Amino acid sequence: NTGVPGPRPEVAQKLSTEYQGHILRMISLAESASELDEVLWSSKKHLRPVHIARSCLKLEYLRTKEKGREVSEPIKNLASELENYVELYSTKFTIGQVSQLVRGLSSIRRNIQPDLLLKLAAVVVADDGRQVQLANEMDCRDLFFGFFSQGFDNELFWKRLSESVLPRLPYFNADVVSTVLRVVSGLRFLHNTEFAHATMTALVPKVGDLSPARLADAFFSASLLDPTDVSGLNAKLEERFLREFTSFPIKDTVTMFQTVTVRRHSTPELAAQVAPLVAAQAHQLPVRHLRRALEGMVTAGWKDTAEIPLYAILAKQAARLVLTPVQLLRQLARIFANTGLKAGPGANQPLAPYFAALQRELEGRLAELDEQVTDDFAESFKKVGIAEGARVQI
Amino acid sequence: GTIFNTGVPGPRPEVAQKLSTEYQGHILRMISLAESASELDEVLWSSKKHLRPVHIARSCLKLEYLRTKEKGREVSEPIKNLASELENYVELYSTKFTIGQVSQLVRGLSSIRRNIQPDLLLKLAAVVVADDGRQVQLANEMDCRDLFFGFFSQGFDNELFWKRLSESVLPRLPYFNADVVSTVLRVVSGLRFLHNTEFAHATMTALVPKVGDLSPARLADAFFSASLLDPTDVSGLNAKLEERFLREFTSFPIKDTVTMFQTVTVRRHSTPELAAQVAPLVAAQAHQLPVRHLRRALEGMVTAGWKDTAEIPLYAILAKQAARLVLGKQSAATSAILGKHVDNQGYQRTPVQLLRQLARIFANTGLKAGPGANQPLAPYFAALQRELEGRLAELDEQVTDDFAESFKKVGIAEGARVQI
Amino acid sequence: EPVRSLFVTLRRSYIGKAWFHREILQNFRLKKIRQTVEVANTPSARNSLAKIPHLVTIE
Amino acid sequence: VVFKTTGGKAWNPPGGLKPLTNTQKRSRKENLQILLRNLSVLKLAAENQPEVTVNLFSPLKFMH
Amino acid sequence: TIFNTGVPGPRPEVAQKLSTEYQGHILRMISLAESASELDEVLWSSKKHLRPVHIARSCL
Amino acid sequence: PLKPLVFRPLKLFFWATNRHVHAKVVRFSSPFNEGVPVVDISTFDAFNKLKGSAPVVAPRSLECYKEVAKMVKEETARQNINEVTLHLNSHASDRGVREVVRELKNLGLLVKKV
Amino acid sequence: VRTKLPSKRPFLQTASHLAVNSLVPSVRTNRWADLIKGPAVRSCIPEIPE
Amino acid sequence: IHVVPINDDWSPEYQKLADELVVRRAEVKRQILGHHVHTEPAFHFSLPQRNGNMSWLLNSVHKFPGTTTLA
Amino acid sequence: XXXXXXXXXXXXXXXXXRXXXXXXXXXXXXXX
Amino acid sequence: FRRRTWPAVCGSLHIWKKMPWRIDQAPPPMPDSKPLTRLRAKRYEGIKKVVMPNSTQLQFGLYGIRSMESARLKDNTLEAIRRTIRRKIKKTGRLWIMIRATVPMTKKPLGIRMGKGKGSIDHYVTPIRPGQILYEFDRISRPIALQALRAIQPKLPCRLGLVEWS
RNA sequence: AAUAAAUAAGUUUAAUACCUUUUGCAGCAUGGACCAGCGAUUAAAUGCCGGUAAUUAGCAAAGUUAAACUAACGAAAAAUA
RNA sequence: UAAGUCAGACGCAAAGCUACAAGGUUUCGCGUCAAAAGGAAAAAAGUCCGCCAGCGAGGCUAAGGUACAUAAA
RNA sequence: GUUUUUACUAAUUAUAAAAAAGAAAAGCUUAACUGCAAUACAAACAAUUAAAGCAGGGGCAUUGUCGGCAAUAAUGCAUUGAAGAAAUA
RNA sequence: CGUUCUUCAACCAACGGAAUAAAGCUACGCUAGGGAUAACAGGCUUAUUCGCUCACAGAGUUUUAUCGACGAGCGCGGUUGGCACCUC
RNA sequence: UAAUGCGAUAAUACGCAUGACGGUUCAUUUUUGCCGUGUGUGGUCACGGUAAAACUUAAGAAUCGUCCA
Ligand SMILES: [K+]
Ligand SMILES: [K+]
Ligand SMILES: [K+]
Ligand SMILES: [K+]
Ligand SMILES: [Mg+2]
Ligand SMILES: [Mg+2]
Ligand SMILES: [Mg+2]
Ligand SMILES: [Mg+2]
Ligand SMILES: [Mg+2]
Ligand SMILES: [Mg+2]
Ligand SMILES: [Mg+2]
Ligand SMILES: [Mg+2]
Ligand SMILES: [Mg+2]
Ligand SMILES: [Mg+2]
Ligand SMILES: [Mg+2]
Ligand SMILES: [Mg+2]
Ligand SMILES: [Mg+2]
Ligand SMILES: [Mg+2]
Ligand SMILES: [Mg+2]
Ligand SMILES: [Mg+2]
Structure with missing residues (x-):
């Protein structure tokens, strides 16, 4: 002071x-959710908006170690208890504090009540966006992603925020610009607008300053937002990937390869793309990323080779994860069928483990299956060569 | 201090x-x-050797005031124990009380939901009706008022007792205040055997010129009783009461307005006053509307036929208010604390009968609860499911079927919890 | 293998000990030499036992 | 212990406090080993604490 | 101090x-006692002072 | 003999530099949180405005001091602000600041020191 | 503090907290330590046979 | 040295909440102490009234209130 | 280990060492 | 451990904190030539047992003498030591004196009972801290320094040592 | 301090009276030669605080003494009509 | 309890007074005695271990001991 | 006591008080009041210490402060006697 | 004549101040008490006193023959003191 | 915080001007000592403190000097 x-x-x-x-x-x-609950219980009467805002981020930090399991029960209890303070202090928060509240509660996959979101949005709707200036760069990137993750769709909120942030876009860091770009691609009422053009232009000279994860997101968003390269982002992003193809993590390499493939720019780089996958297939490939890898390889048209049976390994990896939503299972089965590999006839076929796991899972969830779902599975089963109504050999 | x-x-x-x-x-x-039950007990204990019937009558009356302070909860243990000790003194002095003292004694014990023993209650009744009620003449209006309501709440249904009491009070009815007459009318309505007696007609006639003096609470009760007692409106009280309500529609509290509005709807006298009726409810919904009155408002509005409007979704807010009462969630806001909102009194378990009645009324409203993400009736049923989960022992075959019918009517029959 | 409880046995008498140390023994409810008690393994209990390591044996 | 060597009260024999014998030295060594052992145990307990505390029954708590 | x-x-x-x-x-x-487990703990703590009157009442 | 501090939601601040005088109006919800500036007018803005129409000597002139007060009055009137409390410090005794305060009071804004 | 009269400070502080709790409801309504508190057991080790 | 409101409420409506808390605190103290710790005097006479308040100073003559008529 | 040690001791009838049907297998208490 | 209450941790009135002289580790300053005071002192002011810092060295000379123990020396003792050192070393020797007796001590005459106030000044003393350097020498050889050390050791109640600059 | 606990009956081990007064007495501080008899918070009136009862008390004998009690905010509405 | 008490003592650890003396004197932190039998150091108020409802020719220990006196290498 | 100005920031028996504060200079004034007071510090008791707030009549400002003096010493129970005013008899 | 309110004064400075005021002698003395408290003796302490060792400066003048010091340490319980532990 | 700071008419329109060298003032708790409490045959013990006192190597900031290597 x-x-x-x-x-x-x-x-x-x-x-x-x-x-x-x-x-x-x-x-x-505090090192655990159990410890954090006791800290808040002792300090019940001495909690202020700054303390409430910091606690929400603490839940985000604590759940990072629980990478595999879902949100634990004590974390859910803390989130419910905190929301009682948010309503009480709904009109006593700053723009920086509101920014970190939404991010903290959004990382726990929690949904805020619509009445509370409307009240918190007044920070940017009131005073004609004056308070936006007070917010720094870190606050801005959390406001865009935090409110977008909450499913908050209000034209007045997004219009005012875009106008008040437009002047500062060229001077933000590259990763922050990428975050804004992804949000714009997800909102229909911001496509082909001056804000979108300015955001793309600001990213043109900052392509080299993007992180791998943000670089992949920008390329994915740019491809959908701007099919015709009127900004030059796609050319620069593709060039960076080619130069640093092997210097990025597996998950980022898969994402870029799929995006390039769907752009109809396939090149004889499959030999280079296959080797990283087999080297790291049992790890760094969740269910979502495996689907992207399958789509890219199948769309590109790579054929299974004796030296590297990538499809055989992928099928085994898919079976391990299953042993998930029915839609994902159906989509994966269709992609495997499009690969053109057999599963039933041969004693040891590349796709046999996947279909065997699929049958076991469906037997336990027969209630969810519908007539359309059964027909789609039957088509996939017929394509791979299993149509006798019998279980897979393995 | 110093x-x-x-x-x-x-x-x-x-x-x-x-x-x-x-x-x-x-x-x-x-x-x-005395400001608490424990304090009053200490005063009586230290003064046992000098207590008299006048002291016992006041002590029992004080139980009414202490209970009022401790609202939002049932009668506490100290109040119950204090009432038990006072009963022993009533038995001791049962033969020394006057009519006025007996009237105070019954009123205080009735307000605490305490049932006087039949043998003692008979003795107290005998004192009042002894000598054909010739001693009842030397009593004021308040003494007569408390005699009628005090014994009625106790449940004393001796025909000879009420016959003698009615005969003595009959000549004095024209000279009683409007509130006193209204209390008498309430007792007459509750006693079936006096429905068609000349006493009931005398009471109604005596109340004709005193309608303007009725208080809002007594006025609402009088209109309710008059509807059941005189459906033909021969005395003209219903006409006069309806006229006053129309003139002073917005001059009464919310609770009295709801009660009168429901009575009009069941009388099939509905008029295009729904626009005027809706605004007060939304203006004051978080307060002045407990569970019982909330049900009354729903029945009146549904019977009248008001439909949900975009500007004022009365049904939507009522569902939120019902859910708040069932859950018992409180708020620490300064405005809520200073406003003495009913919802902040705490948690009070409600009978399953009211829950079924509310569920049926909401279903009859015609609004959906499940299909839409944010539907008017979503919060009520979501709260209902949580409350019922903790009291499954009270659910029987009939209750489950009754709710199931309501759940299907609103559109929730997939065996899944409410979205909210 | 988690440690869920501790066993504390008294070795020395109350005679000749400071009054602020006798309070700790009374909170653990140890009154006689060779008497044993079982307590939950919590940080608050360990802190108290660290102030009187010369009066008891811990396992 | 007494260190004072003056006065008519003979707390110690002439010559002051006497030196420890071999048995007394051994006695004091063992008293310190017990104290050090207790502190070592508390270190083991702290490094192996479970997430949830065990609840132990007591008749007096049950009554009230 | x-x-x-x-x-x-x-x-x-x-x-x-x-x-x-x-x-x-x-x-x-x-x-x-409001459950079998609580009654089991009550009897165990009082094992040294159990009498025939206590055994009969527990079965009831 | 320092007086106890009194919390106010709306306060007026002045920053007197070698070259200009800055005036701000800030709203507060509690002493523990940052405020929100609702008005931000300095003699730099007045100089750019008057110089185009009426020549002035320099930003620190009587003409600019009155112009700054007028611009502050308009912004507060538009936002429905009629009463403010002045924060007293060393810069508050500057001659340029005192002229601005006097003009504001005559225009109609009620400025309180305590 | 020099006086030997017993201090009434604990009484004065309790009267203040009780008044606030009576009139102002709390914001939290649950405590995790109470929610997961397990059943009471006799001991954490097997009994020693005689 | 600062005093912070209960729920960080700096609005001008907090003053009335404080006034109610003061009244409640006195009631809590009287309940804990007991009835035999008397907090008001009860004499066999009434204290004089001056300027509309209660005064501890006596008048020249003691008289019963309301026991005299005009003239 | 506490569970794997209580079972072994429980599977031992020490009161059967004073029943005259005993041999040199009723005293082999430790190692079965 | 520190013996204070919670209100003291937050609102202590001891704003300007000075370490007490009895335990302060700062080296004592060089003696001055101010006149001796006539104000009675307390006995603690003439005693100090805390050791000297672990960075003390010679400041002016090449050789010196230090004390390995604490002690309280009177004015008479210092004068005898000064004459012994001067005679032993030479007339053409450089000597620094780092100590001086400045703390008065009182005494009462024989035949006086206890009480009736404090006595009158009798002599002056100075405290000596362990490891403190008392004298420094220059323009001499090491053997001469040893001779000075041996000359004064019988005249002092504390063990003495030699210090050299390097 | 003339006894105690034991014993193969030979003996072995333990062991500085009491009162009064004192920070502290085997006391080189005080009192007693021994036995029998005598020898020290009692009664009245009044007041305060517990316990146990009477259920106002005393006279007189359908009428009198003593004590005790004697307004504080008339505040509840629980009708599946 | 509207009772008794308002003569205190010493050990370890600090400070004032005395002479960084007193089994001195004045304050202060803990303990013991006072009002505390039993065991060890020679006898042993205040040091070390330890708190006696009663009996017994059972057992394990504390401080301290383990060529004789005097139980145990 | 209270308003205004500024090339000033001291002194007390002793003392690292204090810058939206003081001292000095200029102007107007008598709150160095009447009747009450939540809650605390301290304290064997007696007394001793700080004080938000309410009503009346005022002072300087023009909506803030004033129930004596930077703070920590300048004192004395009850009784008896005397004075001003008021109420009885 | 009495009561209340607004106020003050005198001795209380032995300053919680009251029996209105108010000095001495006793070796002619008397009674009730204390080693809770002095004088002789014992006890504790050792400043002081006394003795020894280190120190070998300075006188003697080759000799530490003899005399002898500043200063420091230790001992004794016989000098002058301190304390109030035993006995009124 | 260049709508900055400083100035010898000192006012601020005009003067010096944000780099670079030099000299001053402000991390494995830097790690040792030391202090406090507890226990203690007077230290082969434990924990904490030093934003109270001695003690290391930096990096930065604020003035100041300067035709600049
Ligand atoms: K002991
Ligand atoms: K004899
Ligand atoms: K006196
Ligand atoms: K004598
Ligand atoms: Mg002796
Ligand atoms: Mg041993
Ligand atoms: Mg004596
Ligand atoms: Mg004799
Ligand atoms: Mg005395
Ligand atoms: Mg005394
Ligand atoms: Mg002594
Ligand atoms: Mg005694
Ligand atoms: Mg053994
Ligand atoms: Mg032997
Ligand atoms: Mg007092
Ligand atoms: Mg005013
Ligand atoms: Mg003042
Ligand atoms: Mg005599
Ligand atoms: Mg003596
Ligand atoms: Mg003494």
Whole structure:
């Protein structure tokens, strides 16, 4: 705290005490959801909007170690308890605090009540977007992704935010611009607009400053948003991938390869693409990424080779994960059928493990199967060569 | 402070001026100023050797005031124990009370839902009706009013008791206040054997020139009773009561307006006043509408035929209000605390009968609950499922079928929880 | 293998000990030499036992 | 212990406090080993604490 | 005057058995039990002071 | 003899530099949170406005001080702000600041020191 | 503090917290430690036979 | 040195909430202490009234209230 | 280990060492 | 452990904190030539047992003498030591004196009972801390320094050592 | 301090009276030679606080003494009509 | 309990007074005695271990001991 | 006591008080009041200490402050005697 | 004549101040008490006193023959003191 | 915080001007000592503190000097 006059009395008149720092330290020191609950129980009467905002981010940090399992019960209980404070302080938050509230609750895959989201949106709807200026770059990237993840669709909110952020787009970091680009591609009322053109242009000179994950997202969003390269993003993004094809993680390499393939720019690079997958197939390939890999390889037209039976390994990996939504299972089966490989006739066929796992899973979830679903599976089963109404050999 | 030791609150000038006086009656003031059940018990314990019937009558009456303070919950243990001890003194002095003292005794014990023993209750009744009620003449209006309602709440249905009481009070009906007459009318309606007696007609006639003096609460009750007692409106009370309600539609509290509105709808006198009726409900919905009155509002509006409007979704808010009452969630906001909202009183278990009635009424409204993501009736049924899950033991075959019919009517029959 | 509980046995008498150390023994409900109690393994219990390691034996 | 060597009260024999014998030294060594052992055990307990605390029955808590 | 700093923490949780002073409360404890597991713990803590009257009442 | 602090939702601040005078109006919800600036007018804006129409000598002139006060009055009136509390500090005693405050009071804005 | 009279500070603080709790409801309504509290057991080890 | 409101409420409506809390606190204390810790005096006479408030100073003559008529 | 050690001791009838049907197999308590 | 209450941790009035002299580790300053005071002191002011810092060295000379123990020396003792050192070393020797007796001590005459106030000044003393350097020498050889050390050791109640600059 | 606990009856081991007064007495501080008899919070009136009962008390004998009690905010609406 | 008490003592650890003396004197933190039998150091108020409802020719230990006195290498 | 100005930031028996504060200079004033007071510090008791707030009549400002003085010492129970005013007899 | 309110004064400075005021002698003394408290003796302490060792400066003048010091340490319980533990 | 800062008419329209060298003022808890409490035959013990006192190597910021290597 200082009494010296200055240009920004808004951020200089804030009162900071030792007691507030004491509570914030306890929140950060908590190492588990069980410990964090006890910290909040002791401090019930001494929680302020800053403490509530920080706690929501703590839930995001705590759940990162629980990579495999779903959201734990104590995390859900904490989220419900915190929401009681959010409603109480709905009109006492800053734009920076609201930014980190939505991100924290969105990372736990929780949905905020529509009445509460409307109240929190007043930070950017009131004062003609003056408060947007107070927000820094880190706040802006969380506001776009946080509200987008919540499913909040309000034209006035998004129109005002876009207008107040347009001047600063060229001077944001590359990753932040990529985040905004992905959000725009997901909103129909922002396609082919000045905001979209400005965002694409600002990214043109910042292509080389993107991180692998953000680089893949930008290329995916750019391809859908701008089929015709009127901004030059696609050419630059493709060039960077070619130069650094082997320098990116597997999941990023799969995403870019699929996007390039669907752009009808396939090249004889399959030999280079296959080797990374077999080297790292049992890891760095969740169900979503495996589907993208299958679509890209099948669309490109690579044929199974004796040296590297990629399809055989992929089928085994798919079976391991199954042993999921029926739609994903149906889509995977169709892609395998389009591959042109047999499963039933041969004793040891590349696709045999997948279909065998599929039959076992369907038997346990026969209630979910519908007439259309059964017909689609039957077509896939007929295509691969299993139509006798008998279980797979394996 | 300076007068007393550390931690002792300073004197209140209002209380100090009452206790410091040249006149006697110290014990009566001490019991009258008691602020809790435990405090009153200590006063009686330390003054046992000097208690008299007048002290016992006041003590039982105080139980009414202490209960009112502790609202939002049932009768507490200290109140019950205090009532039990007072009963022993009533038996001891049962032969020394006057008509006025007996009237106060019954009223206080009735307000706490305490059932006087039949043998003792008979003795108290005998005192009032002894000598053909010739001693009832030396009583004021309040004493007569408490006699009628106090015994009726107890459930005393002795025909000879009521016959003698009615005969003595009959000549004085024209000279009683409007509120006193309204209380008498309520008792007459509840007693079937007096429905067609001359006493009922005399009461209705006596109330004709005193309609304007009725309080909003008594006025609402009088209109309810008159509808059942005189469906032909021969006395003209219903016409006069309806006229006053129309003139002063917005001058009464929400609870009285809802009760009168429901009575009009069941009388098939509906008029294009729904627009005027809807706005007060939405204006004051979080307060002045407990579970019982919320059901009354739904029945009146549904019977009248009001339909959901875009500007004012009355049915949608009522579902949220019903869900709030069932769950019992409270709010710490300063406005809610200072506004004394009913929803912040706490949690009170409601009979399953009301839950079935509300569910049926919502189903008859014609609105959906399940299909839409945000439907007017979504919050109520979601709260209902949570509440029923914790009280499965009370569910039987008939209750389950009744809810199932309501669930199908609204459009939830897939065996899945409500979205909200 | 998680440690779920601790066993504490008293070794020394109350005579000649400071009054602020006798309170700890009374909270654990140890009154006689060679008497044993079983307590839950919690951080608050371990902190108290660290103030009187010379009066008891812990396992 | 007493260190004072003056006065008419003979807390110690002439010459002051006497040095420890071999048995006394061995006695004091073992008293310290027990104390060090207790602190080592508390370290093991802290490194192997379970997530959920065990609930132990007590008749007096049950009554109230 | 002050030998410990901070707010006193939670009391330790100690497993205890019934003492001879409370032998007359066994019948009350049986009545207050609300489950088989609780009754099993009540009898176990009072094992050294069980009498034929207590065994008969438990079966009831 | 320092007086106790009193919390106010709307406060007026001045920043006097070598070259210009800056005025801000900030709204607060609590002392522990940052405020929201609702008005931001300096003699730099007035100089650019007047110089086009009426020549002025420099930003720190009587003409610009009155112009800044007028612009502040319009913004507060549009936002329905009629009463503010002035934050007193070393810069508050500058001659340029005092002229602006006097003009604001005459225009109709109620400025309170305590 | 010099006086030997017993202090009433704990009484004065309790009266303040009780008044606030009576009138102002709390925001939280659950405690995880209470929710997952397990059944009471006699001991954590097998019994020693005689 | 600062005093922070209960729920960080700095609105001007907090003053009335504080007034109610003061009244409640006195009631809590009287309940805990018991009835035999008297908090008001009860004399065999009434205290004089001056300027509409209660006064501890006596008048020259003691008289019963309301026991005299005009003239 | 506590469960795997309680079972072994439980599977031992020490009261059967004072029943005259005993041999040198009723005292082989430790190692079966 | 620190003996304070929770209100003291937050609102202590001891804003300007000074370490007490009895335990302060700062080296004592060089002696000055101010006149001796006539104000009685307390006995603690003449005693200090905390050791010297672990960075003490010679400041001016090449050789010196240090004390391995704490002690309290009177003015008479210092004068005798000064004459012994001057005679032993030479007339053409450089000597630095780093100590001086400045703390008054009181005493009462024989035949006086206890009480009736404090006594009058009798002599002056100075505290000595372990490891402190008392004298420094220059323009001499190492053997001469050893001779000075042996000359004064019988005249002092504490063990002494030699310090050299390197 | 003339006894105690044991014993193969030879013996072995343990062991500085009491009262009064004191920070502290085997006390080199106080009192007692021994036995029998005598020798020290009692009664009245009044007040305060517990316990146990009477269910106002005393006279007189359909009428009198003593004590005790004697207004504090008339605040509840529980009708599956 | 509207009772008794308002003569205190020493050990370890600090400070004032005395002479960084007293089994001195004045405050202060803990313990013991006072009002505490039993065991070890020679006898042993205040040091070390340890708190006696009663009996017994059972067993395990604390402080301290384990060529004789005097139980145990 | 309270308003305005600024090339000033001291002093007390002693003392690292204090910059939206003080000191000095200029102007107007008597709150160095009447009747009450939640809640606390301290404390064997007696007394001693701080004080939000309510009504009346005022001062300087023009909606803030004033129930004496930077703060920490300048004192004395009850009784008896005396004075001003008011109410009885 | 009495009561209440607004106020003050005197001695209380032995300053919680009251029996209105108010000095001495006793070796002519008397009674009730204390080793809770002094004088002789014992006890604890050792500043002081006394003795020894280191120190070998300085006088003697080759000799530490003899005399002898600043300063430091230790011992003794016989000098002058301190304490109030035993006995009124 | 270049709508900055400083100035010798000192006012601010005009003067110096944000780099570079030099000298001053402000991390494995830098790790050792030291202090406090507890226990103690007077230390082969435990924990904590030093934003109270001694003690290391940096990097940056604020002035100041400067035709600049
Ligand atoms: K002990
Ligand atoms: K004899
Ligand atoms: K006196
Ligand atoms: K004598
Ligand atoms: Mg002796
Ligand atoms: Mg041993
Ligand atoms: Mg004595
Ligand atoms: Mg004799
Ligand atoms: Mg005395
Ligand atoms: Mg005394
Ligand atoms: Mg002594
Ligand atoms: Mg005694
Ligand atoms: Mg053994
Ligand atoms: Mg032997
Ligand atoms: Mg007092
Ligand atoms: Mg005013
Ligand atoms: Mg003042
Ligand atoms: Mg005599
Ligand atoms: Mg003596
Ligand atoms: Mg003494």
